[PDB]
Amino acid sequence: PSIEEFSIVKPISGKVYLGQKGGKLYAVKVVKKADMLALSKSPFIVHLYYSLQSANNVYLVMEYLIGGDVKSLLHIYGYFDEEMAVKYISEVALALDYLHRHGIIHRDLKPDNMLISNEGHIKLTDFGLSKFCGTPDYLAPELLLGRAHGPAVDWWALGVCLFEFLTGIPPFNDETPQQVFQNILKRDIPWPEGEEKLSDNAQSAVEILLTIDDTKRAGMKELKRHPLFSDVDWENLQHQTMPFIPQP
Ligand SMILES: [Cl-]
């Protein structure tokens, strides 16, 4: 496995490039060696292939997902209806539980980091393969206060993503980041009113996921037994049909 055997096609976007070998496409993220392994094979995690290290740079070869991220798809859709948001949130929750069972706290969950499989499924990344800094829309209250802080933070972020999937804008999103920090520490959740109202089960899930109390917050077991996820076949989730499929 040589690094020069990857014809760099297009830059994806701390930089990722679309490389090519024998017809196969790959997402190669570059990390400068100044900053600076273990395989995690899971249906809801971006599969990593190689970790080639050249002169003064380290290269990460991962599978290429043409579906993009969930933030862009959310901007196209404006917002997801309930069943799409619950499917996506379910898959992200299985990824989170797989990550916690391996001793990993994702610490940076957001729609930017959720990639879309060719069959419509969700794969997480930027959890240890790649990673204070704004935006603080997805940080838990215990993160702002500078305290410890365990894996429950990953679920708080989930409660944000859920809300963001259902309404369109994140709940604690506001003008300046200080105002956002206030909205988080005060837990001012701008519930939609009128005909755009959230269902009681959705409101319950967003409430139990966004609890200020670290030890009273929701986890994998809480969502499993939650009325919003009672239609979820957890033991066989990577074979459900997804509302959006990327092509070509
Ligand atoms: Cl968990």
Author numbering: 30 to 42, 47 to 69, 85 to 179, 738 to 854
Which passages does the manuscript contain on this structure?
The mitotic kinase MASTL (microtubule-associated serine/threonine kinase-like) - more commonly known as Greatwall kinase or GWL - belongs to the AGC family of serine/threonine protein kinases and has recently emerged as a potential target for cancer chemoprevention. GWL exerts its biological activity by phosphorylating α-endosulfine (ENSA) and/or cAMP-regulated phosphoprotein 19 (ARPP19). Once phosphorylated, these proteins become potent inhibitors of the protein phosphatase 2A complex (PP2A/B55). Negative regulation of PP2A/B55 by GWL thus results in a positive feedback loop that boosts CDK1 activity above the threshold required for mitotic entry.
Although highly related at the amino acid sequence level to the N- and C-terminal kinase lobes of the MAST kinases (microtubule-associated serine/threonine kinase; MAST1, 2, 3 and 4) and other AGC kinases, GWL has a highly unusual architecture, with an ~500 amino acid insertion between the DFG and APE motifs of the activation segment connecting the N- and C-terminal lobes (NCMR; non-conserved middle region). We therefore excised the NCMR of hGWL and replaced it with four amino acids 496 - RTFC - 499 taken from human PKCα, to generate the expression construct ‘hGWL-KinDom’ (see Experimental Section). Diffracting crystals of hGWL-KinDom in complex with STU were obtained from commercially available screens. The structure was determined by molecular replacement, and refined at a resolution of 3.1Å. As expected, hGWL-KinDom adopts the classical ‘two-lobe’ protein kinase domain fold. As both the C-helix and activation loop regions are disordered in electron density maps, this strongly suggests that just the non-phosphorylated form of hGWL-KinDom (in complex with STU) was selectively incorporated into protein crystals. As expected, STU occupies the nucleotide-binding pocket, making hydrogen bonds to the backbone carbonyl and nitrogen of hinge residues Glu111 and Leu113, via its lactam nitrogen (N6) and oxygen (O6) groups, respectively (nomenclature as described in). It is also ‘sandwiched’ on both sides, by several hydrophobic residues, including Ile41, Val49, Ala60 and Leu163 from the N-lobe, and Thr173 and Leu163 from the C-lobe. In electron density maps, we can observe amino acids 825-854 of the GWL C-terminal extension, containing both the C-lobe anchor (CLA) and the majority of the C-lobe tether (CLT) motifs (bottom). As in other AGC-kinases, such as PDK1 and PKCα, the GWL C-terminal extension wraps across one face of the C-lobe, making an extensive series of predominantly hydrophobic interactions.
